[PDB]
């Protein structure tokens, strides 16, 4: 699953080849700056350790040496700038080409990349993947070569000056390189590892949030919160172990640096004392070979990121190569010009590309001339829509062929074909565009004249006059701000402006009003003579005007002929017609007040590890002083031994203190985030649904808070004290020890350390992640891609993919340009600051030559002042960059504390209310009005009234959303109204309890939703916080014929169900949810869409679960088909807020109305 290296860089032109070769050479010369620097320093230390002894010409020697340092500094300035910029420009150009090209191929792909290859996963295989290639072939390969250079240069210097010590520093070099390698991997991408412990828990957190209303209604907070807590403690353990490992890694790196110092000096003093070497010879060889041996470990993540790069480029390239058999960028199909409209279907079969096992269609044969209109009648899902698709060559037959105007479409161009044809599907959708462009979608040259013409044609001119911004109003997403009438009218007008020739409609009058349906149909009919038409409708009003009427059985057209044809047959359509006629906050330390022993030991170890650097400065300056002074061999030997031993002990203390600081601050951080997520969640399940509706308060925002808050607050409590105290020990001691050893040089060199400190921070970001990678700009380009991606098959027949392809490019142009400039900007700052380090050895040491020449200090005094402020500012930067940001984290903690302290209007945990002793089961509604807090302008119900009694099985039926979802949340208290009055047995639910109400009665939702638990769990979940009996389950589970399918499946009551209902179908689940509240044994029965997805022979055993238990309960059944409603006691049909009817059934039948039709769909 990897693509070769030669076939990796294929989207690079001549300019990109010059950007890669020069960046590589520039990086090969910038990596030889450190080793060469150690060649000059070890040479300047032999000067400073031979003068003053015999101050003559000492100043002159230092000026010549200063030139060398400024030369290396300038070389590194130029080479760094080139390397970083050129490599970031070669990867910035290629990746852009690949984005455009990948997206160009994704659009022009044969239908069948949504059933076979999931689509969201395609967004993760696009955006993310593209970013992974970018990080792969980008700047990293620069970094690699540089480090490689520092290897070879290193050892070459090591072997040229003196080799007896290079073989020794090399004998241990595997371990040095291995520690460096391990540390390099833990340094890079150390912020992209926080979703491993919150991955398994993320699911449980998302699942409870997905159905908050069901948990509140059924009581089941407790067990959900408990599952959560368990997930938590697991993630906590993993986090602690990772913190321990990170700090052990850095500790071992420092232990090995220091023990290698110890060995180098213990042996190099034997060499020096035997006259063989000098001290410059030892400092050069040792420093250079050590730098080489670590900079070969710095080069491990480059190979790791390259392997990832090609491992993803494989799959991308295999998409881009995939040329579909049927497409529109082949341009080979003939373009016909004599169009008359000749639909010819002869033996057309089909098996779903999604599922080949079932052929829902078994052969058809029909012929339709121009102007000939045919209606099509059948059940919803008889292959009507899919056949209207297959008309436009959205698919191809499995046996046979479809032809038009004599010849078949299997050889001619499709673009002209899929253009000249208009098709309004079952549900036409519209995107985030303008109504001018909404209509203009068909083709290009559609003028405002044509726009106004179409809005006249489809009666779509009214909302122009009544709603302002008459031609530039931004319709909602998927057509939201509009209504069904506006949607359907702009749909028919748009389908008219494309200059159609064959017009195919699917359920053309689902939601259209009385006048609206008629005007839609007539506007369509005035265009039925110069253009063929085939219609599908369920209202038989939009069928009569067809020339022929067809009958769908197994997707086949078996009944054919005009009206009188089937009206003498007395068939199916006959039966149809005969039945019809804020503020910041600083108290966050009072969140983590309880874990103080941890912070005490943490501050202590921070102090020790921050003071270890001046200790090294002193020891190093003194161990060179050992060789400048005039002593004997024996005193030099003993002081060299003691100082080597102090180096070793410093290394060991460094290791221990690092592991300890890591342990303790990591454990305090994990305890904090654990407790914090627990409390956030707990306080989350107390807010009403009138808090949980808002789409500015979405599940995705909540999941980000749960994890993100954890991260942020853990940062802005523990890491802040870690960092401040390390840095204070470090630079406080460095500056204060320097000021008293020479103030002249410290005053100068303390006007540099801002830039050395800043230089360390910018480098650190460059070393691990921190490549800016702005995605907010990318999100806008991505959002356009997501739209087309959601309905690629539906849009392709519109042919608008061009006008979306370009909607990609013209958008990607903003950030690309910007990103280009940035790969220059960063390339200088980095470079500049690196240069500054190489310049310090020229300034300080030059000034040093002055002072040592006027006996205002000593050599080892300059070494101690320099080593303790320059290296100190380096350490200050590298430390202050290895910790989370502050202001971000402070804002996160601000919001978390904002929500923690919350107090809901109505508490679900609070016991308040009415806890009566008796009840009969009566409900009454009066002048009750109900409104959202987010949607006040659109009303649903308009102050209705009801009267429901005990055992009385209420009957209610409506269309798709006239207010039947309304009444549910009014009885199980998700909603609060501002008007009306409700009397449950004369006892208002606005006074009565809200949890005591819930242990008393139990309802069923539209659909069953379920757990990652056992089947026994969800069915027993229906009642909690009380001793549940295994037999009560086998009571209702058998009572509903649902245990029958439980005892057969292995682990009958012990099979861990799939997620949310993937391991079974609906008919299996529609039992267990009614059976869920069956075990509740309430005093009020409520169902809603209980025959939604269930077998007509199981709707008996599921409705019999009612009848023998209807007793005592205020039974309110609501279904779609009247099969179960006709046995319900009292029928209350609704229409848009006003109570359409209420009373005995024959009150609804002798006076015939909208119900007289609602039972007239398919009666027998």
């Amino acid at each position, epitope marked *: 699953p990897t693509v070769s290296v030669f076939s990796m860089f294929r989207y690079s032109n001549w300019l990109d080849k010059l950007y890669m070769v020069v960046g590589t050479l520039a990086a090969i010369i910038h990596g030889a700056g450190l080793p060469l620097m150690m060649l000059v320093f070890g040479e300047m230390t032999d000067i400073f350790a031979n003068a003053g002894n015999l101050f003559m010409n000492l100043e002159e020697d230092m000026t010549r040496y200063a030139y060398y340092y400024s030369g290396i500094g300038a070389g590194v300035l130029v080479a760094a700038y080139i390397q970083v910029s050129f490599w970031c420009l070669a990867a910035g150009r290629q990746i852009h080409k690949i984005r455009k090209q990948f997206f160009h191929a994704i659009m022009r792909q044969e239908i069948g990349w949504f059933d076979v290859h999931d689509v969201g996963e395609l967004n993760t295989r696009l955006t993310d993947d593209v970013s992974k290639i970018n990080e792969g072939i980008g700047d990293k390969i620069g970094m690699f070569f540089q480090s490689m250079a520092t290897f070879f240069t290193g050892f070459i210097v090591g072997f040229t000056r003196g080799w007896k010590l290079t073989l020794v520093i090399l004998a241990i070099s595997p371990v040095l390189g291995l520690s460096a390698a391990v540390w390099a991997k833990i340094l890079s991408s150390f912020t992209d590892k926080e979703l491993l412990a919150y991955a398994k828990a993320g699911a449980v957190a998302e699942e409870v949030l997905a159905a908050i209303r069901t948990v509140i209604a059924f009581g089941g907070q407790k067990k959900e919160l408990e599952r959560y807590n368990k997930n938590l403690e697991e993630a906590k353990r993993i986090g602690i172990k990772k913190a321990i490992t990170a700090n052990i890694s850095i500790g071992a790196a420092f232990l090995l640096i220091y023990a290698s110092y110890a060995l180098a000096f213990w042996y190099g003093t034997t060499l020096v004392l*035997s*006259g063989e070497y000098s001290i410059g010879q030892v400092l050069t060889v040792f420093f250079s070979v050590l730098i080489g041996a670590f900079s070969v470990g710095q080069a491990s993540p480059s190979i790791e990121a390259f392997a990832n790069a090609r491992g993803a480029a494989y799959e991308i390239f295999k998409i881009i190569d995939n040329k579909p058999s049927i497409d529109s960028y082949s341009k080979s199909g003939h373009k016909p010009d004599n169009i008359k409209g000749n639909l010819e279907f002869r033996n057309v079969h089909f098996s779903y590309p999604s599922r080949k096992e079932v052929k829902i269609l078994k052969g058809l044969n029909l012929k339709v001339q121009s102007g000939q209109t045919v209606a099509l009648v059948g059940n919803s899902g008889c292959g009507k829509s899919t056949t209207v698709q297959l008309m436009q060559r959205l698919y191809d037959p499995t046996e046979g062929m479809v032809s038009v105007d004599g010849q078949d479409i299997r050889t001619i161009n499709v673009r002209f074909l899929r253009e000249i044809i208009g098709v309004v599907s079952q549900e036409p959708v519209l995107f985030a565009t303008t109504i001018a462009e909404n209509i203009r979608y068909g083709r290009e040259n559609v003028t405002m004249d044509e726009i106004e013409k179409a809005v006249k044609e489809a009666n779509a001119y009214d909302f122009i006059m009544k709603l302002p911004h008459k031609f530039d109003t931004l319709v909602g997403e998927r057509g939201a701000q509009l209504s069904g009438g506006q949607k359907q009218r702009i749909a028919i007008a748009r389908a008219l402006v494309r200059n159609p020739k064959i017009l195919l409609l699917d359920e053309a009058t689902s939601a259209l009003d009385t006048e609206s349906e008629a005007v839609v149909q007539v506007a369509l009919d005035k265009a039925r003579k110069g253009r063929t038409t085939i219609v599908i409708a369920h209202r038989l009003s939009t069928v009569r005007n067809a020339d022929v009427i067809a009958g769908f059985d197994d997707g086949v057209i078996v009944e054919k002929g005009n009206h009188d044809e089937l009206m003498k047959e007395k068939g199916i359509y006959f039966k149809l017609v005969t039945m019809q006629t804020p503020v910041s906050f600083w108290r966050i330390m009072k969140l983590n007040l309880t874990e103080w022993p941890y912070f005490v030991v943490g501050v202590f170890c921070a102090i020790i590890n921050g003071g270890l650097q001046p200790a090294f400065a002193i020891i190093f300056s003194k161990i060179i002083g050992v060789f400048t*002074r*005039i002593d004997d*061999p*024996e*005193t030099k030997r003993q*002081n060299s031994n003691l100082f080597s031993l102090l180096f070793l002990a410093l290394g060991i203390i460094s290791f221990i203190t690092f592991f300890l600081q890591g342990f303790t601050f990591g454990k305090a951080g994990e305890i904090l985030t654990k407790r914090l997520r627990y409390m956030v969640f707990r306080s989350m399940l107390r807010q009403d649904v009138s808090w949980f509706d808002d789409p500015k308060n979405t599940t995705g925002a909540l999941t980000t808070r749960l994890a993100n808050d954890a991260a942020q607050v853990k940062g802005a409590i523990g890491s802040r004290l870690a960092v401040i105290t390390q840095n204070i020990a470090n630079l406080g001691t460095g500056i204060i020890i320097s000021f008293i050893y020479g103030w002249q040089l410290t005053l100068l060199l303390l006007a540099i350390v801002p830039i050395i400190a800043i230089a360390g921070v910018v480098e650190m970001k460059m070393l691990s992640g921190q490549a800016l990678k702005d995605k907010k700009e990318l999100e806008g380009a991505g959002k356009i891609a997501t739209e087309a991606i959601e309905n690629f098959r539906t849009v392709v027949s519109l042919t608008q993919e061009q006008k979306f392809e370009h909607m990609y490019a013209q958008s990607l142009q903003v950030p690309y340009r910007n990103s280009l400039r940035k790969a220059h900007i960063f390339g200088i700052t980095f470079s500049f600051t690196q240069a500054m380090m190489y310049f310090s050895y020229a300034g300080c040491f030059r000034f040093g030559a002055y002072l040592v020449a006027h006996k205002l200090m000593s050599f080892e005094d300059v070494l101690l002042v320099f080593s303790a402020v320059v290296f100190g500012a380096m350490a200050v930067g590298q430390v202050s960059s290895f910790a989370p940001d502050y202001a971000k984290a402070k804002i996160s903690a601000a919001h978390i504390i904002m929500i923690i302290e919350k107090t809901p209007l109505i508490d679900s945990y609070s016991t308040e209310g009415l806890m009566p002793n008796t009840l009969e089961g009566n409900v009454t509604f009066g002048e009750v009005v109900f409104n959202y807090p987010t949607r006040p302008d659109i009303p649903v119900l308009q102050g209705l009234s009801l009267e429901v009694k005990k055992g009385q099985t209420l009957a209610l039926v409506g269309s798709s959303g006239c207010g039947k979802s309304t009444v549910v949340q009014l009885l199980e208290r998700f909603y609060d109204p501002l008007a009306g009055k409700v009397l449950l047995d004369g006892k208002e639910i606005k006074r009565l309890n809200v949890q005591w109400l819930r242990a008393h009665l139990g309802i069923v939702s539209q659909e069953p939703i379920l757990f990652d638990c056992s089947i026994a769990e969800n069915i027993a979940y229906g009642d909690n916080s009380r001793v549940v009996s295994q037999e009560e389950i086998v009571r209702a589970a058998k009572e509903a014929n649902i245990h029958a399918f439980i005892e057969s499946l292995p682990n009958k009551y012990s099979t861990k169900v799939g997620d949310k209902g993937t391991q079974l179908s609906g008919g299996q689940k529609q039992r267990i949810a009614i059976a869920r509240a069956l075990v509740r044994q309430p005093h009020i029965l409520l169902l809603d869409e209980a025959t939604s997805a269930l077998d007509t022979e199981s709707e008996k055993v599921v409705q019999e679960a009612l009848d023998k238990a209807r007793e005592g309960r205020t039974c309110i059944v609501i279904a779609h088909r009247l099969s179960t409603i006709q046995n319900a006691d009292l029928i209350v049909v609704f229409q848009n807020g006003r109570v359409k009817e209420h009373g005995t059934h024959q009150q609804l039948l002798a006076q015939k109305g909208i119900y007289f039709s609602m039972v007239s769909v398919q009666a027998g």
Partner: antibody
Amino acid sequence: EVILVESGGGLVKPGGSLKLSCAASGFTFSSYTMSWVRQTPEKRLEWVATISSGGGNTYYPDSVKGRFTISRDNAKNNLYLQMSSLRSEDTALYYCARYYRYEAWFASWGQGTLVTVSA
Amino acid sequence: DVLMTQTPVSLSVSLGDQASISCRSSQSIVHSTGNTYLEWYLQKPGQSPKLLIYKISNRFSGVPDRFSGSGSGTDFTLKISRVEAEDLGVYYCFQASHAPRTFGGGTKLEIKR
């Protein structure tokens, strides 16, 4: 040049206590190992003590250890030898001595300070 | 310890002649580093001794070219050519290889008159 001048010697009663000093001018006194050497009245030299260039290390032979104590003061450029419980065999002339880079042990001496020890 | 002897005692050298002064150690003088320290010191009547040649074969800055010193192991010798009256005193062969540093007896140089 390098001018060392010592002082502090005279007649002492056995078991007594005395303190010789050696003041040095003309170089960077805070950088050189310094030794004390002694010449007995048979005219046969003998090493007596050494001190490194910062005061840390110090070396005595195996017949003086415990009694003598040599120390230095870099601020005034002084080198002291405090002798306690003197014997009858410690009657001799006492030279300062500097140490020379390239590892020669007594580069630049001083003049004696005779220290007679008797009753 | 290590005791350094010096076999000649009374030298009767004449102006223009040569002189050979031995120093025959007892243990073998070789430091851990591998260097061999053995310096020669001169004392002219009534003065502090002055350093002559350090290590084994070297000359302090400010000495004549007639002074030679060669040898190996425990045997070391000093030679003086063309003896000039400015060269008359007692010669000590210091050695610093082992933790008690020990001078030598001393040789008297009596120029013939």
